[PDB]
């Protein structure tokens with residue numbers, strides 16, 4: 029149980045110190061992507077939400093392979109703009125409905141600290 033609150037301002041700084049193990053101790057879903065949409069990290073809680081096996085999707089493209097329902101201007105378009113601009117910090121509600129019971133969630137997308145990495149944070153609403 030790692031104590032970090034969804035939406036926290038210096039969230040990117042706190043999560044820089046964590047590893048795959050410690051990521052699994054978060055109260056919310058966490059996904060780390062590269063600039064092309066590929067999945068680098070995927071924690072235990074996210075799996076709990078989507079039914080995905082954390083390890084089986086690392087390496088896959090989130091927008092093309094794993095989450096086609098986010099391939100839209102409302103999700104993917106926002107991501108591509110932040111990557112192009114090098115800045116991204118947006119929160120919105122979204123429905124996940126691919127191969128799963130339609131699930132309303134809150135998404136927080138933010139640029140990570142390191143190189144070309146981006147966080148996708150998810151909790152139930």
Ligand SMILES: *C(=O)/C=C\c1ccc(O)cc1
Pocket residue numbers: 078080085094095096097098123124125126
């Ligand atoms: C739509 O396809 C939305 C979300 C989503 C996120 C993660 C995984 O693994 C599947 C689907």
